[PDB]
Amino acid sequence: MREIVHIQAGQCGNQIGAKFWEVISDEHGIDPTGSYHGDSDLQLERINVYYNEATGNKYVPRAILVDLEPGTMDSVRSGPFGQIFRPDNFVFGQSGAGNNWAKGHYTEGAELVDSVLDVVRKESESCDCLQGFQLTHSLGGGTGSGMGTLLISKIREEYPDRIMNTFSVMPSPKVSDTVVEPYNATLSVHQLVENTDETYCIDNEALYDICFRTLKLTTPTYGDLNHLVSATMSGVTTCLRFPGQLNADLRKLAVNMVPFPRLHFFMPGFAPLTSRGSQQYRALTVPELTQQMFDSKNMMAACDPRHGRYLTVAAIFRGRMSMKEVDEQMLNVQNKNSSYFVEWIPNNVKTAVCDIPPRGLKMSATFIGNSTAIQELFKRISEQFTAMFRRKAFLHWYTGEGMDEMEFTEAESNMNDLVSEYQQYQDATA
Template sequence: MRELVHIQGGQCGNQIGAKFWEVISDEHGIDPTGTYHGDSDLQLERINVYYNEATGGRYVPRAVLMDLEPGTMDSVRAGPFGQLFRPDNFVFGQSGAGNNWAKGHYTEGAELIDSVLDVVRKEAEGCDCLQGFQICHSMGGGTGSGMGTLLISKIREEYPDRIMETFSVFPSPKVSDTVVEPYNATLSVHQLVENADEVMVMDNEALYDICFRTLKLTTPTYGDLNHLVSAAMSGVTTCLRFPGQLNADLRKLAVNMIPFPRLHFFMTGFAPLTSRGSQQYRALTVPELTQQMFDAKNMMCASDPSSRSLPHRQCTLPWSDVH
């Protein structure tokens, strides 16, 4: 089986990662205790891509959770699917990175990185045929950007022939926590160009605009943004988690989507996006859905896909039904 090791780092990475596990556990029929309650063989056919099977038939996410402060870990543990994760796979410090890329990359993060790598190695060694790593992080904070890129470079050294996929949330002035976000993102991009194979670009500004304009939420919260990201992550990984012909693993996805090795930044489009009140009045056709998919308003990244300035455009359309 072509297994993946999922890693989530920093406050943003852990929050969208926890939401991602809630969504895919529901899709695979797994309850918060790790017990399967589904009704289709398809749910279990490729479940080993993301889950380990433990004693008693329990399914445990192959996930590593890291942060430089304990707060986010506590909230993940206290969340609806907090008991699903293996307790040994929580790795955290006490000091925090203070939104400082250098602290995450060179000082506080460098002290914790060996502990994280030990857990990653343990998960990788338990795989029959590891296809690669999936990393969830933000580009604006200190831990997600600084320590996240440090981890990516260390994993690349140790597993040079495995695929490295990231879900990277880029900062924006519209939804901003701190003034140093652009510096953290700028310092991180170089690392992603050099050491990642596939980067799914998410952008807080685009996510905020989708919530405000399309979903008609007057004051979108981070929870709303995370819900949107987790739905997109679930859709993107559908072809990995369920049987099918197209993009059945990360390497095939890379072959189909990447024209030049360094040009591996993907924009994610999502359709259908309709506000809660208007869902029952629309029945979208396939051409309408496809048109929506390429519309700039449906992109998780604030950039116009029809612009001539974009160097290359490819597309893959995994199907996902979201209510």
Template sequence: MPSREIINLQVGQAGNQVGESFWQDVLAEHGLDLTGIYQGSDPVQLQRIGVYFAEVNNGSQAKYVPRSLQLDLEAGVCERVRSGPMGALFSPETYLHGEAGAGNNWAKGFYTEGAELIDPILEVLRKQAENCDVLQGFQIIHSIGGGTGSGLGCLLLSKMREEFPDRMLATFSILPSPKVSETVVEPYNAMLSMHQLVDNGDLTVCIDNEALYDISVRALKIQSPTFPVLNGLISKVMCGVSTSLRFPGQLNGDLRKLGMNLIPFPRLHFLMPSYAPISDPKSQSFQGTSVPELVQALFDRRNLLVACDPRYGRYLTAATIFRGNISSREAEVAVQDLQRRNSNQFVEWIPDNVSVTLVSVPPVGQKQAAVALANSTSIQALFQRTHETFSAMYKRRAFLHWYTGEGMDLMEFSEAESNSQDLIAEYQQYQEARAGDEDEYSEEEQQEEAYAEEGSQ
């Protein structure tokens, strides 16, 4: 059976830094060195390696080249990756960059600088797609607070939606936080990006800077965490999410199945990731990782990579992915037990809404680990936070000349704001819905059907 391929795109400075960390972990799990030559001894490592890698035979040894594009609007980041330890891993034609940079401006990334670079990017993307046997979709790693990751990332999403309408578009989107802010216009960039992600993404895994800092300080005991530490946390989650795609396992063998199990309504595709165990390396040997403990940790807000509290919402769906030598019965019983004890936190009108995936390959250096992706209505707190900081500036029309100067219309800001309000209202509506409220649904169902029809057209 051929591997169902995924093409990875890392956009902007944050996207490339996280991407570098992700590829280091993936190489280690598949037994490859930094040039893509196989050094491992376990046949499972090569069984589905084709999901992320293309095999190239030059001479006697097979080399595995990641199916990945490194994109930025200035040369610095791409040059750093190219001259770094992994420079020889990626194909030279997959480094694409502009010269001017986006200057933290969404409009530059989407309309001016990004638009100049989009044709060469699509050309390389088509070439990568044509070399695939059964392309299942794309994953984009980007930050939505800056200019390149948000602007160019959203432009790419909309173009890919036109070009590959039937493929899955998954994004790992790093959301800005007022506590960890680099620029004052982050709320504008984030709001405009959310507007595009709602309409063009199929699966958005939200990663929140605030939660990453919190985990690093509280669990890893690192008082002033650096970017490599934060990126390492993100890549752990990314590797966990993609485990069932990269190794033989039970359930969720590709992106579409993952989406099918997690997304009940097309617009509500924003997922909260969590990882377990997260602990200080010094105290690792003193902690147990029994399956019930892993499950408990996955649904603990302190292990969430999003700064919101699931106790104030309800879980629509969740997917748990266990790694290591874990029996399926043990995992399923632990998940059912947690659901039974916290039944008021799970919507009762979706039965069996927590799926369990088992993969026998643990992360490098660990015996057992688990990742969860949760679709919870409490994520509206995240959108509410962005909405409040956005509204405070937009009321005064502050900094807007930077955006209108690039040819943007003010209407786009208003549209993005109302789309965000609609999304928050939709989450709230399904949070309050109860299994017996049949009459209320007729109108909403019609609305959902209309969305679905629009999507299929």
């Protein structure tokens, strides 16, 4: 039995966590009160992965909610599924970081990290055989970036063998809701590259593009973006909860997707997306899923794959389908787009198949890409960082909390080295 401990920090992390717990709860038939009102036996076969049994025959999610501001905790509690979470896992203080990475990491978060780790240590000790952790947090903010990076560092010190996932929201190219996004982004990326096994990159620009272009929504809100993200997270860990022709735990992906330790930044995607009225026209088949998976505009990371090369990709299908069709479709995708895949990794497409699709759909698929285009994102951030570090635009807010310019220099150097490492393989003819 393989258990995943879920952590969520900051406003964005807590919102995505709430939506994610609503989606998974449906798949496994869990009432808002915690009682089980499902129909299929398989819903309870592997309930232990995300949930703990309570004494009253009700299920409590294994989640840790973290913040430095009671407002988000109050919003989560006063919600459709607020009662599902146990009250002891609401760890919070007051006087939030306020978009200051130093406050989140050094000053404010250091006082609260002890309490958080305590809950984590407890939740972890109860599990029979822990697979790994996963953390949701936006890198653009203060509380999210700071406390997430600190918790990741502490946990990796405590649990070196386990797996560390991360569904993090990067700052967008054009859209910018804060003035000091580049500083927090650079420091968080410096911390993440060393102390993580996987890191799924999400961008609000890409999600808005999906909502407008594909789903044809007129007035999308953060609920729809959280819906898409939660669909991806539920898609990733499908094989640890249902049977299938080919299983694939989180590790099997980590092994198959990470050629070298520093290259673990993935681009996620989901299919199908029929836009509420065009489903009657398109016929749902495996080739259609493959086409929509490998499309450029479907990616959630706001980075064109066609500007780089695919180091390696993974496709997790859900539903009843034939293995020959899947294998031949992956082979055809390789052969047709021969120039967008590296030449020294033959057959660089991982495949997993599960036979329990989502409730409302006949078939579905999740795409995880690892390409060289992601460097563009970091490169962009680096430029902005330089544009504010040459003159020390807002440095006095950070240096007042104990940091120094040296740490900024280390972060910039590490980010540039990561970009160069990614650019190493994006070439032709060697």
